[PDB]
């Protein structure tokens, strides 16, 4: 198991523009295209992303391409976040992956309300952070996925992703 496989399990793989759980235009492996309700706009974003005139459908390889970029950028931004880096730095590999996954999903803006949960992680108070993470819109709107992420934050093992 690793961040790519993990996120690959959580976001799936779709080669054609689709709407995510929030109803936004996305493609590939959870690659958000825009929060705009306009399909054209989404398609434009796609075109900008891939670097060609696609008409909403991409190849597997392309999809993977944007996914690599996505993971990398997420990590990179966590590292540029003064509030985030310390957290990340304090965690073991598995847990870090959970953190990247979370940010890949909700973004820094998203991660912004997790202050208290992040702190419990920092203090290595696993169970408490776990309870805390659950009290959030994030958990409420994507409870299955949240639950896995949370088990990883709590346990430090990939058990939750075993068998998926």
Shortest distance in whole angstroms from residue 78 CB to Cl ion: 18
Which of 81, 90, 136, 142 contacts Cl ion by CB under 5 A?
142
117 is in an annotated binding site: yes
149 binds Cl ion (CB under 5 A): no
> For the chain, what is the HEC assignment?
CCHHHHHHHHHCCEEEEEECCCCCEEEECCEEEECCCCHHHHHHHHHHHHCCCCCCECCHHHHHHHHHHHHHHHHHHHHCCCCHHHHHHHCCHHHHHHHHHHHHHHHHHHHHHHHHHHHHHHCCCHHHHHHHHHCCHHHHHCHHHHHHHHHHHHHCCCHHHCCC
11 binds K ion (CB under 5 A): yes
Nearer to K ion, 11 or 70 (CB): 11
Binding partner at 145 among K ion, Cl ion, none, C-beta below 5 to 8 Å by kind: Cl ion
Residues annotated in a binding site for substrate: 32, 104, 117, 132
Residues that bind Cl ion (CB under 5 A): 49, 142, 144-145
Q: Which residues are catalytic?
A: 11, 20
């Amino acid at each position: 198991m690793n961040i790519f496989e993990m996120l690959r399990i959580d976001e799936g793989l779709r080669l054609k523009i689709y709407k995510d759980t929030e109803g936004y235009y996305t493609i590939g492996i959870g690659h958000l295209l825009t929060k705009s309700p306009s399909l054209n706009a989404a398609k434009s974003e796609l075109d900008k992303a891939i670097g060609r005139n696609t008409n909403g459908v991409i190849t597997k390889d392309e999809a993977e391409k944007l996914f690599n970029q996505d993971v990398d950028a997420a990590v990179r931004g966590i590292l540029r976040n003064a509030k985030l880096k310390p957290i990340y730095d304090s965690l073991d590999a598995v847990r870090r992956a959970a953190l990247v996954n979370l940010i890949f999903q909700i973004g820094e803006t998203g991660v912004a309300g997790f202050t208290n949960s992040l702190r419990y992680l920092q203090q290595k108070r696993w169970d408490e952070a776990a309870v805390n993470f659950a009290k959030s819109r994030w958990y409420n709107q994507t409870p299955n996925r949240a639950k896995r992420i949370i088990t990883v934050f709590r346990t430090g093992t990939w058990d939750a992703y075993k068998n998926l």
